[PDB]
Amino acid sequence: GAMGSEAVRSWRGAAEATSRLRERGCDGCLAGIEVQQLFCSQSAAIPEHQLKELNIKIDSALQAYKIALESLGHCEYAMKAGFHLNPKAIEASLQGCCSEAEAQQTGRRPMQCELPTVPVQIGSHFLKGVSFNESAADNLKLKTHTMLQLMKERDDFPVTEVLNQVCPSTWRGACKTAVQLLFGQAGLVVVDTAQIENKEAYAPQISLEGSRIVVQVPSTWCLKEDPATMSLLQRSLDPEKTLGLVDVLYTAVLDLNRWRAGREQALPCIQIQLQRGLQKTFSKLTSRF
Ligand SMILES: [Mg+2]
Predict the structure, then answer these.
(1) Residue 42: helix, strand or coil by DSSP?
(2) Which of 76, 139, 147, 223 could form a disulfide with 116 if both were Cys (CB 3.0 to 4.6 A apart)?
(3) Ligand 1 center–CA 18 separation, angstroms
(4) Ligand 1 center to residue 287 CA distance, Å?
(5) For residue 17, how far is its CA from the centre of ligand 1 (angstroms)?
(6) Do residues 25 and 61 touch, judged by C-beta distance below 8 A?
(7) How far, in Å, from the CA of 172 to the mean position of ligand 1?
(8) What's the gap in Å between 30 CA and the centre of ligand 1?
(9) Distance between CA 81 and CA 173 in Å, rounded?
(10) How far is CA 15 from CA 97, 158, 191, in A?
Protein backbone atom coordinates (compact mmCIF):
# COMPACT_ATOMS: atom_id res chain seq x y z
CA GLY A 1 0.00 0.00 0.00
CA ALA A 2 0.91 3.68 0.24
CA MET A 3 2.36 3.29 3.73
CA GLY A 4 4.87 0.78 2.45
CA SER A 5 5.73 2.93 -0.56
CA GLU A 6 6.36 5.96 1.67
CA ALA A 7 8.60 3.85 3.93
CA VAL A 8 10.70 2.55 1.05
CA ARG A 9 11.17 6.10 -0.31
CA SER A 10 12.26 7.14 3.18
CA TRP A 11 14.92 4.43 3.26
CA ARG A 12 16.12 5.31 -0.23
CA GLY A 13 16.15 9.00 0.60
CA ALA A 14 18.27 8.41 3.68
CA ALA A 15 20.89 6.35 1.80
CA GLU A 16 20.90 8.89 -1.04
CA ALA A 17 21.26 11.88 1.30
CA THR A 18 24.48 10.51 2.82
CA SER A 19 25.80 8.70 -0.26
CA ARG A 20 29.04 10.71 0.02
CA LEU A 21 29.95 8.41 2.93
CA ARG A 22 30.02 5.43 0.56
CA GLU A 23 32.23 6.65 -2.29
CA ARG A 24 34.29 3.94 -3.97
CA GLY A 25 38.06 4.04 -4.18
CA CYS A 26 40.16 4.79 -7.24
CA ASP A 27 39.87 1.17 -8.36
CA GLY A 28 36.09 1.27 -8.22
CA CYS A 29 35.60 -0.84 -5.10
CA LEU A 30 34.81 0.09 -1.55
CA ALA A 31 38.23 -0.25 0.07
CA GLY A 32 37.14 -2.32 3.08
CA ILE A 33 35.29 -4.75 0.84
CA GLU A 34 38.44 -5.11 -1.26
CA VAL A 35 40.51 -5.83 1.89
CA GLN A 36 38.10 -8.53 3.01
CA GLN A 37 37.91 -10.09 -0.42
CA LEU A 38 41.69 -10.17 -0.78
CA PHE A 39 42.09 -11.67 2.69
CA CYS A 40 39.87 -14.51 1.46
CA SER A 41 41.48 -14.81 -1.98
CA GLN A 42 44.98 -14.85 -0.40
CA SER A 43 43.97 -17.50 2.18
CA ALA A 44 44.64 -15.09 5.07
CA ALA A 45 48.24 -14.43 3.87
CA ILE A 46 48.25 -11.03 2.26
CA PRO A 47 51.87 -10.41 1.23
CA GLU A 48 53.65 -7.55 2.94
CA HIS A 49 53.62 -5.24 -0.08
CA GLN A 50 49.89 -5.58 -0.78
CA LEU A 51 49.21 -5.16 2.92
CA LYS A 52 50.96 -1.78 2.85
CA GLU A 53 49.11 -0.72 -0.29
CA LEU A 54 45.84 -1.73 1.37
CA ASN A 55 46.67 0.17 4.58
CA ILE A 56 47.45 3.25 2.51
CA LYS A 57 44.12 2.88 0.67
CA ILE A 58 42.26 2.37 3.95
CA ASP A 59 43.91 5.43 5.53
CA SER A 60 42.62 7.43 2.53
CA ALA A 61 39.12 5.92 2.72
CA LEU A 62 38.88 6.72 6.46
CA GLN A 63 40.08 10.28 5.81
CA ALA A 64 37.51 10.72 3.04
CA TYR A 65 34.74 9.27 5.21
CA LYS A 66 35.55 11.65 8.08
CA ILE A 67 35.65 14.68 5.77
CA ALA A 68 32.37 13.66 4.13
CA LEU A 69 30.79 13.07 7.57
CA GLU A 70 31.83 16.53 8.72
CA SER A 71 30.38 17.99 5.51
CA LEU A 72 26.97 16.55 6.40
CA GLY A 73 26.72 18.62 9.54
CA HIS A 74 24.22 17.56 12.17
CA CYS A 75 20.78 17.61 10.68
CA GLU A 76 17.96 15.49 12.01
CA TYR A 77 17.04 12.68 9.64
CA ALA A 78 13.70 10.89 9.59
CA MET A 79 12.43 7.69 8.04
CA LYS A 80 9.87 4.95 8.59
CA ALA A 81 10.59 1.56 10.17
CA GLY A 82 8.76 -1.37 8.59
CA PHE A 83 11.79 -3.06 7.01
CA HIS A 84 10.18 -6.51 7.23
CA LEU A 85 7.43 -5.27 4.86
CA ASN A 86 9.81 -5.09 1.91
CA PRO A 87 13.04 -7.11 2.23
CA LYS A 88 14.08 -6.43 -1.36
CA ALA A 89 13.78 -2.68 -0.89
CA ILE A 90 15.82 -2.53 2.29
CA GLU A 91 18.52 -4.85 0.91
CA ALA A 92 18.75 -2.55 -2.12
CA SER A 93 19.01 0.59 0.01
CA LEU A 94 21.63 -0.96 2.28
CA GLN A 95 24.01 -1.65 -0.65
CA GLY A 96 27.42 -0.38 0.45
CA CYS A 97 26.16 0.44 3.97
CA CYS A 98 26.98 -2.93 5.60
CA SER A 99 28.22 -6.32 4.46
CA GLU A 100 26.40 -8.19 1.71
CA ALA A 101 25.71 -10.94 4.26
CA GLU A 102 24.19 -8.53 6.73
CA ALA A 103 22.15 -6.85 3.97
CA GLN A 104 20.71 -10.21 2.81
CA GLN A 105 19.48 -10.95 6.32
CA THR A 106 18.02 -7.56 7.14
CA GLY A 107 14.59 -8.05 5.62
CA ARG A 108 14.06 -11.50 7.13
CA ARG A 109 12.65 -12.17 10.60
CA PRO A 110 7.87 -11.48 22.37
CA MET A 111 7.58 -9.59 25.69
CA GLN A 112 6.93 -12.35 28.21
CA CYS A 113 10.70 -12.84 28.55
CA GLU A 114 12.13 -9.45 27.53
CA LEU A 115 9.76 -6.95 29.12
CA PRO A 116 10.75 -7.67 32.77
CA THR A 117 14.30 -6.41 32.21
CA VAL A 118 13.12 -3.28 30.31
CA PRO A 119 12.76 -0.15 32.44
CA VAL A 120 9.84 1.85 31.17
CA GLN A 121 7.81 4.86 32.11
CA ILE A 122 4.06 4.41 31.58
CA GLY A 123 2.21 7.67 32.04
CA SER A 124 3.60 9.18 35.24
CA HIS A 125 4.86 5.79 36.55
CA PHE A 126 8.45 4.65 36.22
CA LEU A 127 8.58 0.83 36.16
CA LYS A 128 12.06 -0.52 36.85
CA GLY A 129 13.76 -3.38 35.10
CA VAL A 130 13.63 -6.41 37.36
CA SER A 131 16.50 -7.08 39.78
CA PHE A 132 17.79 -10.62 40.26
CA ASN A 133 16.22 -10.80 43.72
CA GLU A 134 12.76 -9.81 42.37
CA SER A 135 9.98 -11.82 40.73
CA ALA A 136 10.05 -11.32 36.97
CA ALA A 137 6.41 -12.44 36.83
CA ASP A 138 5.43 -9.75 39.36
CA ASN A 139 7.39 -7.13 37.41
CA LEU A 140 5.51 -8.18 34.27
CA LYS A 141 2.15 -8.11 36.04
CA LEU A 142 2.78 -4.57 37.24
CA LYS A 143 3.80 -3.40 33.78
CA THR A 144 0.75 -4.92 32.09
CA HIS A 145 -1.60 -3.54 34.74
CA THR A 146 -0.10 -0.05 34.51
CA MET A 147 -0.43 -0.24 30.71
CA LEU A 148 -4.07 -1.33 30.98
CA GLN A 149 -4.84 1.31 33.64
CA LEU A 150 -3.43 4.10 31.46
CA MET A 151 -6.21 3.23 28.97
CA LYS A 152 -8.92 2.42 31.51
CA GLU A 153 -8.24 5.71 33.33
CA ARG A 154 -7.76 -6.64 29.70
CA ASP A 155 -8.50 -8.82 26.67
CA ASP A 156 -10.32 -5.86 25.08
CA PHE A 157 -7.30 -3.45 25.08
CA PRO A 158 -4.08 -3.72 22.97
CA VAL A 159 -1.82 -4.10 26.00
CA THR A 160 0.55 -6.59 24.39
CA GLU A 161 0.72 -4.72 21.09
CA VAL A 162 1.90 -1.54 22.80
CA LEU A 163 4.29 -3.20 25.23
CA ASN A 164 5.87 -5.20 22.38
CA GLN A 165 7.14 -1.85 21.03
CA VAL A 166 9.42 -1.26 24.03
CA CYS A 167 11.04 -4.70 23.81
CA PRO A 168 14.51 -4.46 22.16
CA SER A 169 13.71 -7.38 19.86
CA THR A 170 11.09 -5.11 18.28
CA TRP A 171 12.90 -1.77 17.90
CA ARG A 172 16.63 -2.43 18.12
CA GLY A 173 17.25 -4.07 14.74
CA ALA A 174 15.20 -1.38 13.02
CA CYS A 175 17.16 1.42 14.71
CA LYS A 176 20.49 -0.20 13.80
CA THR A 177 19.34 -0.47 10.16
CA ALA A 178 18.40 3.24 10.13
CA VAL A 179 21.83 4.23 11.44
CA GLN A 180 23.51 1.93 8.86
CA LEU A 181 21.53 3.43 5.96
CA LEU A 182 22.75 6.87 6.95
CA PHE A 183 26.27 6.36 8.29
CA GLY A 184 27.52 2.90 7.37
CA GLN A 185 30.21 2.09 4.87
CA ALA A 186 30.52 -1.61 4.18
CA GLY A 187 33.86 -2.94 5.34
CA LEU A 188 34.99 0.37 6.78
CA VAL A 189 32.54 1.95 9.26
CA VAL A 190 30.17 -0.17 11.34
CA VAL A 191 27.31 0.61 13.70
CA ASP A 192 27.08 -0.74 17.23
CA THR A 193 25.24 0.10 20.44
CA ALA A 194 26.84 2.80 22.57
CA GLN A 195 27.95 2.28 26.17
CA ILE A 196 25.18 3.88 28.24
CA GLU A 197 26.01 4.92 31.81
CA ASN A 198 22.43 5.11 33.12
CA LYS A 199 20.12 2.57 31.47
CA GLU A 200 17.16 4.11 33.31
CA ALA A 201 17.71 7.50 31.65
CA TYR A 202 16.97 5.75 28.34
CA ALA A 203 13.80 4.10 29.59
CA PRO A 204 11.09 4.17 26.92
CA GLN A 205 8.14 6.48 27.51
CA ILE A 206 4.52 5.45 26.94
CA SER A 207 1.92 8.24 26.96
CA LEU A 208 -1.78 8.66 26.21
CA GLU A 209 -2.58 11.69 24.04
CA GLY A 210 -6.31 11.81 23.39
CA SER A 211 -7.07 8.49 21.73
CA ARG A 212 -3.44 7.83 20.70
CA ILE A 213 -0.91 5.77 22.63
CA VAL A 214 2.58 7.15 21.88
CA VAL A 215 5.64 4.94 22.52
CA GLN A 216 9.00 6.74 22.43
CA VAL A 217 12.18 4.65 22.57
CA PRO A 218 15.51 6.50 22.72
CA SER A 219 18.87 4.99 21.95
CA THR A 220 22.46 5.90 21.19
CA TRP A 221 24.74 4.17 18.71
CA CYS A 222 28.43 4.45 17.89
CA LEU A 223 30.18 4.59 14.51
CA LYS A 224 33.43 2.59 14.59
CA GLU A 225 36.14 1.42 12.26
CA ASP A 226 35.21 -2.09 11.04
CA PRO A 227 37.13 -4.27 13.49
CA ALA A 228 37.52 -7.24 11.14
CA THR A 229 38.98 -4.99 8.43
CA MET A 230 41.40 -3.34 10.81
CA SER A 231 42.48 -6.71 12.30
CA LEU A 232 43.07 -8.15 8.84
CA LEU A 233 45.25 -5.15 8.09
CA GLN A 234 47.34 -5.84 11.20
CA ARG A 235 46.43 -2.35 12.46
CA SER A 236 46.27 -1.09 16.01
CA LEU A 237 42.70 -1.85 17.02
CA ASP A 238 41.27 0.12 19.97
CA PRO A 239 37.74 -1.35 20.25
CA GLU A 240 36.67 1.67 22.32
CA LYS A 241 37.45 4.37 19.73
CA THR A 242 34.47 5.93 17.95
CA LEU A 243 34.16 8.00 14.78
CA GLY A 244 30.92 9.43 16.10
CA LEU A 245 27.92 8.96 18.33
CA VAL A 246 24.40 8.89 16.88
CA ASP A 247 21.15 9.58 18.78
CA VAL A 248 18.00 7.75 17.65
CA LEU A 249 14.37 8.15 18.67
CA TYR A 250 11.92 5.41 17.67
CA THR A 251 8.25 6.41 17.89
CA ALA A 252 5.28 4.10 17.55
CA VAL A 253 1.70 5.36 17.69
CA LEU A 254 -1.31 3.13 18.34
CA ASP A 255 -4.56 5.00 17.62
CA LEU A 256 -7.16 3.40 19.88
CA ASN A 257 -10.04 4.53 17.65
CA ARG A 258 -8.42 2.88 14.62
CA TRP A 259 -7.76 -0.23 16.71
CA ARG A 260 -11.41 -0.73 17.56
CA ALA A 261 -12.53 0.33 14.06
CA GLY A 262 -10.03 -2.11 12.56
CA ARG A 263 -8.29 0.67 10.65
CA GLU A 264 -4.67 0.69 9.53
CA GLN A 265 -2.10 1.93 12.00
CA ALA A 266 0.83 4.15 11.06
CA LEU A 267 4.26 2.61 10.73
CA PRO A 268 6.75 3.54 13.48
CA CYS A 269 8.93 6.58 12.79
CA ILE A 270 12.69 6.76 13.34
CA GLN A 271 14.51 10.06 13.91
CA ILE A 272 18.33 10.08 13.73
CA GLN A 273 20.95 12.71 14.54
CA LEU A 274 24.73 12.72 14.81
CA GLN A 275 25.95 14.09 18.16
CA ARG A 276 28.34 17.05 18.16
CA GLY A 277 12.33 17.46 17.57
CA LEU A 278 14.71 14.69 18.56
CA GLN A 279 16.94 16.82 20.79
CA LYS A 280 14.00 18.28 22.74
CA THR A 281 12.58 14.79 23.32
CA PHE A 282 15.97 13.45 24.43
CA SER A 283 16.13 16.21 27.05
CA LYS A 284 12.56 15.55 28.24
CA LEU A 285 13.27 11.82 28.64
CA THR A 286 16.66 12.18 30.37
CA SER A 287 15.17 14.59 32.97
CA ARG A 288 12.66 12.04 34.33
CA PHE A 289 13.17 10.83 37.90
MG1 LIG B 1 23.50 11.51 -2.74
Answers:
(1) coil
(2) 139
(3) 6
(4) 37
(5) 5
(6) yes
(7) 26
(8) 16
(9) 10
(10) 8, 34, 15
